[PDB]
Amino acid sequence: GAMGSMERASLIQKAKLAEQAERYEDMAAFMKGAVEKGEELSVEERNLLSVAYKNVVGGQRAAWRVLSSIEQKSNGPEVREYREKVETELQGVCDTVLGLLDSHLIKEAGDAESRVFYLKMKGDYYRYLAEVATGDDKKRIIDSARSAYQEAMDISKKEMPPTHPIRLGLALNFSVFHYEIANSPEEAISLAKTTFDEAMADLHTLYKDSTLIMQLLRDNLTLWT
């Protein structure tokens, strides 16, 4: 509960409905309920999960940036108070995802694709916490992000082809982590570059997801150089 009385397959079905309706908070609640059934997620089901929370957090991060912008320029208490509200809500979502990753998902993920997928998610949600962090725990949040991403990189390099969309998206986001969280534009640039080049050389074995992501890498390289 709130989702404990609903059938696993009914949760997945409603999550797909919620997606069609752009009800991403419902989507995420339904998928969270699915994970809580204790069984491992399929490919499709992990995709649904990540898209649900990615959207929820994406709206919260977009709003946080607007309020932080307004706050810095105003530098009464109202702007800071409301930014704090959004921030705390955003943190609560990231804690929820990280809690789902730590309790069910990473533990039981035996195959390469699933493990890397969940470790990328773990990196991303610590990265989102790092975007707002200014306390003593900032440093520990950054190294949790790096640590998850690094383990995901190591597995993906041993077990997956260079053109795997999960490998490519991992590198894309890890490279963003280097650039704007860890203040290492050079490492961000080398990682994007090398990922894009190894991927070009393996296209001969595929595709839409992968070319989409390779374009995202090309975009960042163009932005950063």
């Binding site: 991303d124 894309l172 986001n173 963003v176 650039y179 992501i213 995202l216 975009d219 950063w224």
Partner: peptide
């Protein structure tokens, strides 16, 4: 304007 993530 904004770098891509996925």
């Amino acid at each position: 304007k904004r770098r891509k993530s996925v």
